[PDB]
């Protein structure tokens, strides 16, 4: 299986989504025209995973852009790689979702969703062998969160044997738009637990902290946060995009990473951590990459890895380096810290190497972990949800769109089940 269909929803979804296509396009040698101007053949070998060929010979991203507002999509279209997207893959309403999950999922989103599925079907039909879908969205707003999870439900109904994966941005009070973000996040998680196969948890708390503590940026913008996201995203999709042995498609990644169907929320990690523009001149040694990629301070989800156990780990090393030194360092980490890797999944750490480094670095490592420490992320959202929900505060925004309190109670309970299910395996 080859083709992945990419969907980006809402302001956050479309902003990280645009950056993703920007970064991977440069790696595959594709320019704003859709014209290849690269040297290596490794660049084109698996280009069909993400790109359509339309005679030119031009490469068109298999990408559908979705919003309930036109704003951020006009931003994308007049942005750097804006011309590359298929204009018919732009699907927008006018009325917005007002950071309201109920509007995205039930009222405004319901009005727009069929048009999105027409574009999904049109893209799915040109595929030799569709692998499945990736979605970029946030959980804190209304469109990416409410409408994004509506879309996932409808995509699963029409394609139940395909893999569904998400890059899901979790909200934090540190970088926050509205007080209702915990409501929107809890309702979205409930969906994600049932209808995705694999979810990369991108924690805005973590991205903020990395920017503040490590990159010495005193006031991080979304741009700074998204630079970390696009690097992580390029990293986690390396094995899908380039010639390679393991985690080479979406189903094989799921089979190695997900021991129990509900526990499919991954903590990504990246090394070296770099800020935008400002370059680093000294390449990292393989021992340094390996130490940094496993460091809590390189994690994109604000969870302490020492507070849990790793179920499974995938590690991707990028650049020209010694594969023998990689195996040794990877083996050294596990042997040194063996109590943090569950002993009932043997050889639960898999490593891949790709020759092509990302732009502006000679060496990089990407970490994908399924840790039971992710539970800290869900506990945090749960705490914020309950603080409001016990006084039913802000609920009228949701009941006004037809929702009952019961739906909140159920979504909370399911998220608490997920928490305690993680705790079960951290002690087994």
């Amino acid at each position: 299986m080859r083709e992945i269909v990419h969907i980006q929803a809402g302001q956050c979804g479309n902003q990280i989504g645009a950056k993703f296509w920007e970064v991977i396009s440069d790696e595959h040698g594709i320019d704003p025209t859709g014209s290849y101007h690269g040297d290596s053949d490794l660049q084109l070998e698996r280009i069909n995973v993400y790109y359509n060929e339309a005679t030119g010979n031009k490469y068109v991203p298999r990408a559908i852009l979705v919003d309930l507002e036109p704003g951020t999509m006009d931003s994308v279209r007049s942005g750097p790689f804006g011309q590359i997207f298929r204009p018919d893959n732009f699907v927008f309403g006018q009325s917005g979702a007002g950071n309201n999950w109920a509007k995205g999922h039930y009222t405004e989103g319901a009005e727009l969703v069929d048009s999105v599925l027409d574009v999904v079907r049109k893209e799915s039909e040109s595929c030799d062998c569709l692998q499945g879908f990736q979605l970029t969205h946030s959980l804190g707003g209304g469109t990416g969160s409410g409408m994004g999870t509506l879309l996932i439900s409808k995509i699963r109904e029409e394609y139940p044997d395909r893999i569904m994966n998400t890059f899901s941005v979790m909200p934090s009070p540190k970088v926050s738009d509205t007080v209702v973000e915990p409501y929107n996040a809890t309702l979205s998680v409930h969906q994600l637990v049932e209808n995705t196969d694999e979810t990369y948890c991108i924690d805005n708390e973590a991205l903020y902290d990395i920017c503040f503590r490590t990159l010495k940026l005193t006031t991080p913008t979304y741009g700074d946060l998204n630079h970390l996201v696009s690097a992580t995203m390029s990293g986690v999709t390396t094995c899908l995009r380039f010639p390679g042995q393991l985690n080479a498609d979406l189903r094989k990644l799921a089979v190695n990473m997900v021991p129990f169907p509900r526990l499919h929320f991954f903590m990504p990690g990246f090394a070296p951590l770099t800020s935008r523009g400002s370059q680093q001149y000294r390449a990292l040694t393989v021992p340094e990459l390996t130490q940094q990629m496993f460091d809590s301070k390189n994690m994109m989800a604000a969870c302490d890895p020492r507070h849990g156990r790793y179920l499974t780990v995938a590690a991707i090393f990028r650049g020209r380096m010694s594969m023998k030194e990689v195996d040794e360092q990877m083996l050294n980490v596990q042997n040194k810290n063996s109590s943090y890797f569950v002993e009932w999944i043997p050889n639960n750490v898999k490593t891949a190497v790709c020759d092509i480094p990302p732009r502006g670095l000679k060496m990089s490592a990407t970490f994908i972990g399924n840790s039971t420490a992710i539970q800290e992320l869900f506990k945090r959202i749960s705490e914020q949800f309950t603080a409001m929900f016990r006084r039913k505060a802000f609920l009228h925004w949701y009941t006004g769109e037809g929702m009952d309190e019961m739906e909140f109670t159920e979504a909370e309970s399911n998220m608490n089940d997920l928490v305690s299910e993680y705790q079960q395996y951290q002690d087994a």
Binding site: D327, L331, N335, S338, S339, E343
Partner: protein, 334 residues
């Protein structure tokens, strides 16, 4: 930081070894079933040798030699001595022995019993100790399992004062390179009650086991005479050293037993590495002839010596493979 697991709870020797390994702070202990160890201090029974040395990036080591039971079960030791060209029936430091079953060499045993009956020369045997043949065979089928019939040593050396029997325990460490190391300290395990040539029924004056004694404690603390004292004695009474009259023979026996099984048990070209501590039990007769009693695969030490020997185990068996940031052993040269 080196790692290790512990799979034998009842081992005083290894309890002390781990305690020492922890106290260097360069060794970390893991849970029983974590496969990511450098060192296994394993179980006595059914040790999973098949699962060792298949962990990439880990040099693995275990404190047992697979196949050393050929030396350490009484039935197996007899078989090993009789059938190996290096030892043979011709062997002169092992008592005449026969292997006997209930539902085998019962036939060949009774044949040698009658040549003893010919000249009526001392015809007493062990299994537990009897004068007449058919009273031993009737004890055998009464019990269940397999056991050995062995010529009993009717003229032991007897310590004065007190007309006392004894046995010598020697501790031997065989490292991963198959160097054979004899711990310089041995121990004599003495009888307290005088030896009785004409009554084998009185059993605590004939069997020297440290448990079976507890007359106990009379002449030496806990029925344990150490080396300096026994040497002093042999000089004073018999005008000879421990070295000349006994230890030359002991060193010879130890090296013969262990050179014999070396091709069957060596881990020299294997994917994992082994060491083992043995306890060799020796009897000395009245002419100062040394006889091998048995070989113990999982021995305990003597209280006074736990510290020194356990430290040596760490020094020559463990740190030799896994070095950190004089000797108490005599190397037996083969």
């Amino acid at each position: 930081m080196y790692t290790f697991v512990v799979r034998d709870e009842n081992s005083s020797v290894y309890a002390e070894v781990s305690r020492l390994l922890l106290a260097t702070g360069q060794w970390k202990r893991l849970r029983k079933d974590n496969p990511r160890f450098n060192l296994m201090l394993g179980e006595r029974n059914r040790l999973p040798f098949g699962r060792l040395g298949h962990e990439p990036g880990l040099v693995q080591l275990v404190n047992y030699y697979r196949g050393a039971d050929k030396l350490c079960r009484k039935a197996s030791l007899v078989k090993l001595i009789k059938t190996s060209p290096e030892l043979s029936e011709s062997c002169t430091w092992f008592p005449e022995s026969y292997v006997i079953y209930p539902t085998d060499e019962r036939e060949v045993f009774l044949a040698a019993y009658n040549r003893r009956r010919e000249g009526r020369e001392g015809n007493v045997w062990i299994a537990l100790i009897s004068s007449e043949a058919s009273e031993l065979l009737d004890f055998i089928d009464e019990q269940g399992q397999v056991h050995v019939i062995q010529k009993y040593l009717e003229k032991p050396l007897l310590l004065e004062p007190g007309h006392r029997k004894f046995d010598i325990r020697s501790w031997v460490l065989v490292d991963h390179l198959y160097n054979i190391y004899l711990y310089r300290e041995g121990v004599l395990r003495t009888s307290s009650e005088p030896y009785n040539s004409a009554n084998f029924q009185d059993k605590t004056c004939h069997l020297t086991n440290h448990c079976i004694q507890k007359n106990y404690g009379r002449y030496e603390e806990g029925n344990e005479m150490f080396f300096e004292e026994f040497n002093q004695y042999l000089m004073d009474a018999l005008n000879t050293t421990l070295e000349n009259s006994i230890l030359l023979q002991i060193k010879h026996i130890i090296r013969s037993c262990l050179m014999c099984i070396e091709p069957a048990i060596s881990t020299k070209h294997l994917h994992y590495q082994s060491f083992q501590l043995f306890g060799f039990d020796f009897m000395v007769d009245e002419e100062l002839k040394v006889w091998l009693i048995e070989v113990n695969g999982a021995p305990a030490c003597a209280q006074k010596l736990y510290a020194e020997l356990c430290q040596g185990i760490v020094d020559v068996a463990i740190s030799s493979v896994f070095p950190l940031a004089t000797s108490i052993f005599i190397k037996l040269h083969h």
